[model samples]
Target: STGSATTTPIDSLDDAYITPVQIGTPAQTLNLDFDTGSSDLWVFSSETTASEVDGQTIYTPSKSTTAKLLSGATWSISYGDGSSSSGDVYTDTVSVGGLTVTGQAVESAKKVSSSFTEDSTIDGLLGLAFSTLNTVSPTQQKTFFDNAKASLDSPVFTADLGYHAPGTYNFGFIDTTAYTGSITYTAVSTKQGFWEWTSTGYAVGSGTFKSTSIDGIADTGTTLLYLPATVVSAYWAQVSGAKSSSSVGGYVFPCSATLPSFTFGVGSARIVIPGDYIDFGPISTGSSSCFGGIQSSAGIGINIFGDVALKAAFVVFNGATTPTLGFASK
Candidate 1:
């Protein structure tokens, strides 16, 4: 089976991509963030605290005839930012991109972090990463991709995220017309429960490619591209007035400064992120300095190739026994 779903950018900076998901017997549609960094199909629900609820849509298991409580099942997840959420679990009819999972585990949030509660664009998260990362207690559940892969024509899914525009998430088969050039495939490390891979090198603007191996994960859930301080400093050195500032929370530079494009390699293939993409946006309204989309990952420990890099290519998340990542420019 094959299915296609439209994913829309939530903000001007393309902070996150939201996909419409159908759940329950009556098909309650909710806009969820398609997060590949984590593995837990969680949502704000009737069980969620009233005070924690914002303007997000909620799922009520009591209203779904197909909903069944997963006895003794519970889950809790904490993010790097120190925000957290925990709740009960239920199995319900869930569908995405016209593909259905009869008894998909649906984590119903009884409580959510303020960061999530304030974000009105996303109702919840639909994790696409390996099921091993699931935080469910007792018995972990599989992700939507894992559950649906058996019936799919191919055990894979493709992410075509856009910059300030609508993109697509295709299941089963790849659309040849969606990207240009041949795809460059690389082995992935599933041991980390992520689409982790190593980039051959990097280049700033039109400079020569630096042959430095950098290990990172392709995380759709994250907003920025984070690299080692050495690489980040290399890129900023090309700009006239860029500096790492704790006051601004990260590297910031004059909004009008000429920003250079960034490129990273996957074998001999290089994906170039346009200069404008690295500019990110103004640090604050009308501020002369702007926050950079690429920053140092010293504190994060792990480098992240987030939406900033993913938007520049069509990425394939292979779900075969031996998983691989495919990248192709568009």
Candidate 2:
């Protein structure tokens, strides 16, 4: 059994970037995205050039009483969305929960855009994920987990995404209280940072929706859960009064009553998805409505169970031990 230990806030500095916490104080919190695809922790800087950044919050170390920057290393990162930034590294003192880590590595961008420069609520990003996705070589330069390993109570870490809310993504140790029983483990695929499995079939509300088995991958970077087009359409057709709307990319639907529960079978285990996930509607626009949860990516070959699906479960990535993955109740 793992011994009892307390969690401390982690802060460290490297040549690349500084980790970020939510916008509000310790009392109220915001959602934090722990990305494994990248290694740098960057926040928006007010002093950046106008063209480089967009739709993000910039950090102004000069305003904060506690901040630091690394001396020589220079850094920059571009997203799949085509936005990017460039800056230098620094060290700073940071606090999370009751714990504190001084001299944390952070990146101070010299060039950024208004979307990132203008936001005051978002402080920065914490890269507790992997270094492989990093833009620069020697990916081991710095990561939130690597810097905070000393403060963690255990070698294991788990992310429990709360319902609707971004949920609590914890570090240092795994909280067994959130789970129901023994953890189910699976081996990880090394080529890309994702959990892969072959499915036998799927069921929804007492009905066997599909017999055509498919391979699935779990990814944190994607916002929505995507299944094969035939699978999604057939499943939606079964729900009474569940008609597809064209407003929100055509994956959305309107249902007056609670929707039925759905399940995906992987080998002998069955992964159940709740009703609310199916009932998702489009993001509000003036005139038309769309499907929120289901959509089509015709060219994209892989089936992705994105953040929307991950939020409903507890996930543990065991890359250190045997390149395996595990799932349990949250």
Candidate 3:
């Protein structure tokens, strides 16, 4: 059997994408970000300190008879951006689309960073990375996808994320009609618990494609496309009125700046990010200056092919022994 669901942008800046998921006995529905960058199905909960709740929706396990504490178990997570959350664990029935898994490990947060508490619309995260990456203490947790995959017709799932538009996540089967041209497949290294692969380099506009070879991961949870520090400067150098701003964070350019097209290689195929997509919207909530979608992957071990890059192509997160990603122009 297959399951399918639509994803939507929480903001025009296209910071992140979220899909609906159901949890519990009576099934309390919640909006969750399907993050491939990390593992752990965590959500805002009744357990969160009252003051920390803010505008976020709370998941009350007490309301679900199917929910039971995994006694003494707990979890805590921190992101590259300093965002974090920590809480206790529960075993409950959780489902995505029409697929359901019994005794799924659900981490309900008792504490969350300010960035998470302030984001009212996002209820939690539905992690899609390898089960080994799950962050539960005392014991590792299994992802909902891993638990439900055996019953699925196919072991594969697809993420068709879009920019400021509706997208869909498909499981068990690939909707062949969703993409055009041939799908370019690339081998991945998951040693770091990510869909990691090396690119044959990239180019700015119609310039020649370099063979610099960049190692990175396909992360939907991250919002920007990050590359090596040196590469980011090369691309931004071509843009007019672009400068690094500590106040705005990262590289910022005039809203009217003309950005050249960017392209990267995967296997024998190369996917290009149109110049328009390079503009990541204003630097801040009401600012006129815009931030470049591509940033420096400094400190971070691997570059990130976040929504900005994945949205440029149809991505297939194949969970085979060698786990690879197939990309095709949308």
Give the lDDT of residue 219 in candidate 2.
58
Q: Could you give candidate 1's per-residue lDDT for residues 1-330 as a string of tens digits?
A: 987999999988898899999999899999999988999999999999999999999999999999999999999999766778899999999999998988999999999999999999999999998999999999999999999999999999999999889999999999999999999999999988999999999999999999989999999999899999999999999999999999888899999998999999999999999998887788989899999999999989899999999999999999999999999999
lDDT of 3 by residue, 76-114 (tens): 999887999999999999888888889999999999999
Pairs clashing within candidate 3: none
Compared with the true structure, the alpha-carbon lDDT of candidate 3 equals 0.88
| Residue 45 lDDT, candidate 1, scale 0-100 | 98
Instruction: Estimate every model's Cα lDDT from 0 to 1.
Output: 0.94, 0.54, 0.88
Question: Candidate 2's C-alpha lDDT?
Answer: 0.54
C-alpha root-mean-square deviation, each candidate: 0.8, 6.9, 1.3
List the candidate 1 regions with Cα displacement exceeding 4 Å.
none
TM-score of each predicted structure versus truth: 0.99, 0.71, 0.97
Backbone clashes in model 1, listed as residue pairs: none
Winning candidate number (TM-score): 1
* Of candidates 3 and 2, the better by lDDT: 3
Off by over 4 Å in 3: none
Q: Report the error of model 2 at residue 217, Å.
A: 4.7
